[PDB]
Amino acid sequence: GSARQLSKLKRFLTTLQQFGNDISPEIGERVRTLVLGLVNSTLTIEEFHSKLQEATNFPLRPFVIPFLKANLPLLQRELLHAARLAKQNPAQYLAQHEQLLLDAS
């Protein structure tokens, strides 16, 4: 498969969202929101590329859409580890609520 080969960005993403709260509150909440969002929450690359684009300083970064597009399945993996280091559940790590579970209807 193409997991490890694409995991090259996984690490960066993990630390990016983990330390993203250090650089600042704005970009922080956003980074984690988008990242963790498309990971478990209902989010799309485009949307994750929008807020981020206006969240991170400087002009659009090189390969944004195609970035998480091939790392989506790689980011949803580390999420299972975050919960262990967050003292919470892997699916509740981001949700942290009931109403925000499966409100399809």
Side-chain angles (χ1 to χ4, degrees):
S2 47
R4 246 295 264 289
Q5 55 173 254
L6 260 51
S7 299
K8 189 208 286 267
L9 181 277
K10 186 210 87 185
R11 311 189 85 185
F12 174 96
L13 224 296
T14 333
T15 178
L16 158 146
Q17 62 168 276
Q18 294 257 278
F19 219 79
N21 224 350
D22 205 316
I23 172 179
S24 25
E26 29 145 291
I27 184 47
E29 62 176 67
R30 219 110 64 159
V31 160
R32 59 200 223 162
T33 284
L34 317 195
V35 174
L36 310 172
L38 51 86
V39 171
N40 336 262
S41 220
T42 294
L43 260 98
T44 178
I45 302 275
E46 197 190 64
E47 176 92 296
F48 138 91
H49 145 96
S50 149
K51 257 101 84 105
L52 218 152
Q53 170 41 35
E54 63 166 302
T56 70
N57 53 41
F58 258 46
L60 192 59
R61 41 132 133 289
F63 312 112
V64 202
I65 294 299
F67 229 48
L68 258 295
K69 259 280 271 191
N71 286 306
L72 218 310
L74 271 310
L75 258 299
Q76 55 95 291
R77 330 214 58 81
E78 71 209 62
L79 230 300
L80 264 175
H81 193 49
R84 309 303 311 279
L85 199 82
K87 296 99 211 205
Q88 332 203 231
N89 258 264
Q92 311 197 67
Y93 175 55
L94 162 146
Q96 310 175 317
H97 209 43
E98 184 70 59
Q99 287 279 324
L100 210 65
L101 177 99
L102 293 149
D103 183 55
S105 48

